[PDB]
Design a protein around this ligand. Structure first.
Ligand SMILES: [Cl-]
Length: 94
């Protein structure tokens, strides 16, 4: 019945919270509402699929090329978090 591990489930929740804060942080810097920078739905997808690149984050529903550039600090949060812990990134069919 379950598809992911209990640890994967934890990881996604923890990363999601880091992305929420990162979203609030940068959206402020850029003078955009956080939801305009990235919706919660986009943040969930980023927590599950964990892109670390502009090309990979463009593979997420709702992310354009120019939006990908705006989401760059969030990609940094992902790659660092996954490095510190020991978690696979870029879960795409590549
Ligand atoms: Cl969290």
């Amino acid at each position: 019945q379950p598809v992911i591990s209990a640890q994967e489930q934890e990881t996604q929740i923890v990363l999601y919270g880091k992305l929420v804060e990162a979203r609030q942080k940068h959206a402020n810097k850029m003078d955009v509402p956080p939801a305009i920078l990235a919706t919660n739905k986009i943040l969930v997808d980023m927590a599950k699929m964990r892109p670390t690149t502009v090309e990979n984050v463009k593979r997420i529903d709702g992310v354009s090329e120019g939006k990908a550039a705006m989401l760059a600090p969030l990609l940094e949060v992902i790659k660092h978090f996954c490095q510190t812990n020991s978690v696979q990134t870029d879960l795409f069919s590549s």
